Scaffold this motif. Structure first.
Motif, PDB file in Angstrom:
ATOM      1  N   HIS A  97      14.425   5.036   0.090  1.00  0.00           N
ATOM      2  CA  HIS A  97      14.714   4.943   1.548  1.00  0.00           C
ATOM      3  C   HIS A  97      13.703   3.975   2.189  1.00  0.00           C
ATOM      4  O   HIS A  97      14.174   3.124   2.949  1.00  0.00           O
ATOM      5  CB  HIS A  97      14.780   6.337   2.216  1.00  0.00           C
ATOM      6  N   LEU A  98      12.394   4.084   1.868  1.00  0.00           N
ATOM      7  CA  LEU A  98      11.286   3.246   2.433  1.00  0.00           C
ATOM      8  C   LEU A  98      11.539   1.787   2.073  1.00  0.00           C
ATOM      9  O   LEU A  98      11.503   0.941   2.987  1.00  0.00           O
ATOM     10  CB  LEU A  98       9.935   3.713   1.879  1.00  0.00           C
ATOM     11  N   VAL A  99      11.822   1.534   0.798  1.00  0.00           N
ATOM     12  CA  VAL A  99      12.023   0.155   0.280  1.00  0.00           C
ATOM     13  C   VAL A  99      13.296  -0.455   0.899  1.00  0.00           C
ATOM     14  O   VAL A  99      13.222  -1.652   1.266  1.00  0.00           O
ATOM     15  CB  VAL A  99      12.043   0.103  -1.262  1.00  0.00           C
ATOM     16  N   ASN A 100      14.412   0.292   0.997  1.00  0.00           N
ATOM     17  CA  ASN A 100      15.679  -0.212   1.601  1.00  0.00           C
ATOM     18  C   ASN A 100      15.429  -0.455   3.081  1.00  0.00           C
ATOM     19  O   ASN A 100      15.679  -1.561   3.555  1.00  0.00           O
ATOM     20  CB  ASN A 100      16.858   0.764   1.578  1.00  0.00           C
ATOM     21  N   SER A 101      14.973   0.577   3.782  1.00  0.00           N
ATOM     22  CA  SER A 101      14.926   0.597   5.264  1.00  0.00           C
ATOM     23  C   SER A 101      13.983  -0.495   5.784  1.00  0.00           C
ATOM     24  O   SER A 101      14.407  -1.252   6.686  1.00  0.00           O
ATOM     25  CB  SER A 101      14.570   1.974   5.810  1.00  0.00           C
ATOM     26  N   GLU A 102      12.776  -0.590   5.222  1.00  0.00           N
ATOM     27  CA  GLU A 102      11.622  -1.236   5.907  1.00  0.00           C
ATOM     28  C   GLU A 102      11.100  -2.414   5.080  1.00  0.00           C
ATOM     29  O   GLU A 102      11.044  -3.525   5.617  1.00  0.00           O
ATOM     30  CB  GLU A 102      10.491  -0.228   6.165  1.00  0.00           C
ATOM     31  N   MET A 103      10.662  -2.148   3.854  1.00  0.00           N
ATOM     32  CA  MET A 103       9.823  -3.106   3.101  1.00  0.00           C
ATOM     33  C   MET A 103      10.648  -4.353   2.801  1.00  0.00           C
ATOM     34  O   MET A 103      10.071  -5.455   2.803  1.00  0.00           O
ATOM     35  CB  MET A 103       9.257  -2.479   1.823  1.00  0.00           C
ATOM     36  N   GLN A 108       5.402  -5.212  10.725  1.00  0.00           N
ATOM     37  CA  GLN A 108       5.002  -5.975   9.513  1.00  0.00           C
ATOM     38  C   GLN A 108       3.568  -5.604   9.150  1.00  0.00           C
ATOM     39  O   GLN A 108       3.327  -5.333   7.954  1.00  0.00           O
ATOM     40  CB  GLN A 108       5.055  -7.483   9.704  1.00  0.00           C
ATOM     41  N   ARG A 109       2.662  -5.636  10.139  1.00  0.00           N
ATOM     42  CA  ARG A 109       1.239  -5.187  10.028  1.00  0.00           C
ATOM     43  C   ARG A 109       1.175  -3.803   9.380  1.00  0.00           C
ATOM     44  O   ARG A 109       0.487  -3.637   8.336  1.00  0.00           O
ATOM     45  CB  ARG A 109       0.537  -5.101  11.390  1.00  0.00           C
ATOM     46  N   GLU A 110       1.889  -2.857   9.970  1.00  0.00           N
ATOM     47  CA  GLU A 110       1.834  -1.442   9.540  1.00  0.00           C
ATOM     48  C   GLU A 110       2.384  -1.320   8.097  1.00  0.00           C
ATOM     49  O   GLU A 110       1.807  -0.530   7.328  1.00  0.00           O
ATOM     50  CB  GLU A 110       2.500  -0.593  10.623  1.00  0.00           C
ATOM     51  N   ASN A 114      12.726  -5.792   4.648  1.00  0.00           N
ATOM     52  CA  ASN A 114      12.521  -6.619   5.855  1.00  0.00           C
ATOM     53  C   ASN A 114      11.261  -7.475   5.685  1.00  0.00           C
ATOM     54  O   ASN A 114      11.370  -8.713   5.850  1.00  0.00           O
ATOM     55  CB  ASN A 114      12.506  -5.762   7.121  1.00  0.00           C
ATOM     56  N   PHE A 115      10.112  -6.846   5.390  1.00  0.00           N
ATOM     57  CA  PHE A 115       8.749  -7.407   5.634  1.00  0.00           C
ATOM     58  C   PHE A 115       8.010  -7.808   4.356  1.00  0.00           C
ATOM     59  O   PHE A 115       7.732  -9.021   4.214  1.00  0.00           O
ATOM     60  CB  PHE A 115       7.912  -6.426   6.454  1.00  0.00           C
ATOM     61  N   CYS A 116       7.636  -6.856   3.498  1.00  0.00           N
ATOM     62  CA  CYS A 116       6.812  -7.115   2.283  1.00  0.00           C
ATOM     63  C   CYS A 116       7.704  -7.687   1.162  1.00  0.00           C
ATOM     64  O   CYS A 116       7.548  -7.235   0.028  1.00  0.00           O
ATOM     65  CB  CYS A 116       6.101  -5.854   1.795  1.00  0.00           C
ATOM     66  N   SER A 117       8.570  -8.680   1.434  1.00  0.00           N
ATOM     67  CA  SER A 117       9.510  -9.315   0.464  1.00  0.00           C
ATOM     68  C   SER A 117       9.241 -10.815   0.303  1.00  0.00           C
ATOM     69  O   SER A 117       8.532 -11.411   1.134  1.00  0.00           O
ATOM     70  CB  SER A 117      10.923  -9.118   0.906  1.00  0.00           C
TER      71      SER A 117
END
Lengths: 163, 50, 89, 50
Positions: free
Chosen positions: A91-97, A53-55, A99-102
């Motif tokens: 890919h970045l927005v689906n995979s990771e963000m 989440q930090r990263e 999860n966290f920056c939402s």
């Protein structure tokens, strides 16, 4: 509180590489992002979840700083050479963000505006702008539906700037 | 510009001194770009000296 | 009046010197050919008869630059240094 | 004792660095508002030798 000269040196060199490419190809940034996400623990531990989440907030920060041109390139040359770096971002927005920056089945005011700025910039600079915008936002019904579900919430914000 | 001319002189005499130049060659000590970045990030926009 | 104005003049000279270095030159001119206003100006430049900090700072380094410029007749600088040392209820 | 010149904010000067590069790319014959602003402030000052 330490850094805000060096993050300006970064803006310098990002705009340099924008111009050297503007003279199709994808950005090294997204590879660095995927390398650090990879080299983190895939472990589900609250330690690992917070560390990731930090990263990702740090990634969202550095993208807000740097031009919206890194996302959608600049001067989409035709329909054939299309969706270069945007697939990289998706890919970045689906995979990771997501999860966290939402929040709330949706993204952030900030990155939504950062995206739509770069989008209309490259589209309007290129030919057939309305049709090419319609093209990428039909792609998004399939590839990154977040940007749309975000754009439903943050429309009151964007509509002025867009118009 | 800056604090005591004796500290200034000390630094310049060391910098000119030979055996410091002969130490600086074989080097882990030659300040990597990344090492330089760590020290320049360490410092703040609050207390500058420049 | 030429005390409050001279103060506003030397204030600006210094806050400009700072974002620069090497002596705001409006003031260096006012020096050689406005000698009366130079002395009515140069007195609020020596108005630091106060807590002189551990670290030399803006005013301090500006006055340093002047005395290295061979201006500041030493009388006024010596005086500056000395002053700084400092029922019904 | 006005004693030099505090700084306060360069944060805001890096929010400006944003929107400059934004408008620059969006334009790419016509000219900038900067130099209009510059001329207004240089004009609104006194023309004195004071």
């Amino acid at each position: 509180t330490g850094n805000e000269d060096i993050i300006s040196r970064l803006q310098e060199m990002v705009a340099d590489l924008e111009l050297q490419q503007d003279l199709s190809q994808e950005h090294f940034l997204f590879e660095i992002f995927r390398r650090r996400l990879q080299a983190l623990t895939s472990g589900w531990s609250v330690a690992a979840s917070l560390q990731r989440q930090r990263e990702l907030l740090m990634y969202k920060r550095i993208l807000l700083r740097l031009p919206s041109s890194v996302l959608c390139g600049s001067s989409f040359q035709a329909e054939q050479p299309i969706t270069a770096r945007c697939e990289q971002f998706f890919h970045l927005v689906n995979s990771e963000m997501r999860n966290f920056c939402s929040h709330g089945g949706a993204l952030t005011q900030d990155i939504t505006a950062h995206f739509f700025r770069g989008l209309l910039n490259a589209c309007l600079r290129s030919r057939d702008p309305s049709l090419m915008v319609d093209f990428i936002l039909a792609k998004c019904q399939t590839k990154c539906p977040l940007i749309l579900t975000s754009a439903l919430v943050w429309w009151p914000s964007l509509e002025p700037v867009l118009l | 510009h800056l604090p005591s001319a004796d500290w200034q002189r000390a630094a310049l005499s060391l910098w000119t001194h030979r055996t410091f130049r002969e130490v600086l060659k074989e080097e882990d000590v030659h300040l990597t770009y990344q090492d330089w970045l760590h020290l320049e990030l360490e410092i703040q926009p609050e207390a500058d000296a420049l | 009046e030429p005390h409050s104005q001279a103060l506003q003049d030397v204030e600006k000279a210094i806050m400009v010197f700072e974002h620069t270095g090497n002596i705001p030159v409006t003031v260096m001119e006012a020096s050689i050919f406005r000698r009366p206003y130079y002395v009515s100006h140069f007195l609020p430049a020596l108005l630091t008869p106060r807590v002189l900090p551990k670290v030399p700072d803006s005013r301090v380094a500006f006055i340093e630059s002047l005395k290295r410029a061979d201006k500041i007749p030493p009388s006024l600088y010596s005086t500056y240094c000395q002053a700084c040392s400092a029922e019904p209820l | 004792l006005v004693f030099g010149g505090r700084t306060g904010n360069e944060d805001i000067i890096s929010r400006l660095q944003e929107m400059v590069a934004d408008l620059e790319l969006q334009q790419d014959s016509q000219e900038h508002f900067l130099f209009e602003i510059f001329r207004r402030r240089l004009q609104a000052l006194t023309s004195g030798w004071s």
